[PDB]
Amino acid sequence: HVPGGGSVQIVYKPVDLSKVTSKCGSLGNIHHKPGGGQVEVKSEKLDFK
Amino acid sequence: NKNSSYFVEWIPNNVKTAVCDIPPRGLKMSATFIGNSTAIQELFKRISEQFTAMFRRKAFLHWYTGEGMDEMEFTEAESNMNDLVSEYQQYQDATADEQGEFEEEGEEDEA
């Protein structure tokens, strides 16, 4: 007679991470509009015919 | 903290607390322990060798077969206890370090 059993195997799945996006707001915007254009407002026309 | 060697390392912080207001009659305060250790390997280690000591020689066994049991069943009770003591000994001092399949991809080779 061969005496019974004496054999198991481990309940084991290794852990890892997939498709974890680096979605931080650290560079979250790029858009700009200038603070108006350059103009002259200080001078008269002096249009005395 | 002082007994780190007596806890298994991949179950963290191995304690269940719980507190009742009401003590046992005739004690001002008490606590109950229910500890689950690998140490119980000892029970199943001793009993399954004593069991192979018996069924290997069909000793005491005529009384039970004599009630309608079969030798397959002694084998399956044994098969399982030996399997069970092998499961508690698989986890006796089982690593928090990764277990098995330690093989890899190599280096790029000239063609």
Curated annotation (Swiss-Prot), chain A:
In the record, N6-acetyllysine modifications are located at 13, 19, 23, 33, 45, 49
Q: Where are the Tau/MAP repeats?
A: 8-38
Q: Where in the cell is it found?
A: Cytoplasm, Cytosol; Cell membrane; Cytoplasm, Cytoskeleton; Cell projection, Axon
Q: Where is this site: Not glycated?
A: 13, 19, 23, 33, 42, 45
Cross-linked residues, Glycyl lysine isopeptide (Lys-Gly) (interchain with G-Cter in ubiquitin): 13, 19, 23, 33, 45, 49
Which effect does the record note for changing residue 7 to N?
A: In FTD1; minimal parkinsonism; very early age of onset
- UniProt modification remark: Phosphorylation at serine and threonine residues in S-P or T-P motifs by proline-directed protein kinases (PDPK1, CDK1, CDK5, GSK3, MAPK) (only 2-3 sites per protein in interphase, seven-fold increase in mitosis, and in the form associated with paired helical filaments (PHF-tau)), and at serine residues in K-X-G-S motifs by MAP/microtubule affinity-regulating kinase (MARK1, MARK2, MARK3 or MARK4), causing detachment from microtubules, and their disassembly. Phosphorylation decreases with age.
The domain of life for this entry's organism is Eukaryota
Tissue specificity field: Expressed in neurons. Isoform PNS-tau is expressed in the peripheral nervous system while the others are expressed in the central nervous system.
Impact of mutating residue 3 to L? In FTD1; most common mutation; reduction in the ability to promote microtubule assembly; accelerates aggregation of tau into filaments
Query: Which residues are tagged as glycosylated in the record?
Result: 49
N6,N6-dimethyllysine modifications at: 13
The record gives the effect of mutating residue 39 to M as: In FTD1; ultrastructural and biochemical characteristics indistinguishable from Alzheimer disease; accelerates aggregation of tau into filaments
Could you tell me which residues carry Phosphoserine?
A: 7, 26
Q: What is known of its domains?
A: The tau/MAP repeat binds to tubulin. Type I isoforms contain 3 repeats while type II isoforms contain 4 repeats.
Functional summary from the UniProt entry: Promotes microtubule assembly and stability, and might be involved in the establishment and maintenance of neuronal polarity. The C-terminus binds axonal microtubules while the N-terminus binds neural plasma membrane components, suggesting that tau functions as a linker protein between both. Axonal polarity is predetermined by TAU/MAPT localization (in the neuronal cell) in the domain of the cell body defined by the centrosome. The short isoforms allow plasticity of the cytoskeleton whereas the longer isoforms may preferentially play a role in its stabilization.
Subunit record text: Interacts with MARK1, MARK2, MARK3 and MARK4. Interacts with PSMC2 through SQSTM1. Interacts with SQSTM1 when polyubiquitinated. Interacts with FKBP4. Binds to CSNK1D. Interacts with SGK1. Interacts with PIN1. Interacts with LRRK2. Interacts with LRP1, leading to endocytosis; this interaction is reduced in the presence of LRPAP1/RAP.
Name of the protein this chain belongs to: Microtubule-associated protein tau
Q: Which organism is it from?
A: Homo sapiens
Taxonomic classification: Eukaryota, Metazoa, Chordata, Craniata, Vertebrata
Recorded name of the encoding gene: MAPT
Parent sequence residues shown: 616 to 664 of 758
From Swiss-Prot, chain B:
The positions making up the signal sequence are: none
Renumbered to this chain, the Acidic residues biased-composition regions fall at 95-111
The compartments listed are:
Cytoplasm, Cytoskeleton
Record's comment on post-translational modification: Some glutamate residues at the C-terminus are polyglycylated, resulting in polyglycine chains on the gamma-carboxyl group. Glycylation is mainly limited to tubulin incorporated into axonemes (cilia and flagella) whereas glutamylation is prevalent in neuronal cells, centrioles, axonemes, and the mitotic spindle. Both modifications can coexist on the same protein on adjacent residues, and lowering polyglycylation levels increases polyglutamylation, and reciprocally. Cilia and flagella glycylation is required for their stability and maintenance. Flagella glycylation controls sperm motility. Some glutamate residues at the C-terminus are polyglutamylated, resulting in polyglutamate chains on the gamma-carboxyl group. Polyglutamylation plays a key role in microtubule severing by spastin (SPAST). SPAST preferentially recognizes and acts on microtubules decorated with short polyglutamate tails: severing activity by SPAST increases as the number of glutamates per tubulin rises from one to eight, but decreases beyond this glutamylation threshold.
Q: Could you tell me which residues belong to the region Disordered? A: 90-111
Modification type 5-glutamyl polyglutamate: residues:
104
Q: What else is known?
A: The highly acidic C-terminal region may bind cations such as calcium. Pig brain contains at least two forms of this protein.
Instruction: Report quaternary structure and partners.
Output: Dimer of alpha and beta chains. A typical microtubule is a hollow water-filled tube with an outer diameter of 25 nm and an inner diameter of 15 nM. Alpha-beta heterodimers associate head-to-tail to form protofilaments running lengthwise along the microtubule wall with the beta-tubulin subunit facing the microtubule plus end conferring a structural polarity. Microtubules usually have 13 protofilaments but different protofilament numbers can be found in some organisms and specialized cells. Interacts with NCKAP5L.
What does it do?
Tubulin is the major constituent of microtubules, a cylinder consisting of laterally associated linear protofilaments composed of alpha- and beta-tubulin heterodimers. Microtubules grow by the addition of GTP-tubulin dimers to the microtubule end, where a stabilizing cap forms. Below the cap, tubulin dimers are in GDP-bound state, owing to GTPase activity of alpha-tubulin.
> Hey, which family's this protein in?
Belongs to the tubulin family.
The free-text domain note is: The MREI motif is common among all beta-tubulin isoforms and may be critical for tubulin autoregulation.
Name of protein = Tubulin beta chain
Whole-protein coverage range: 335 to 445 of 445
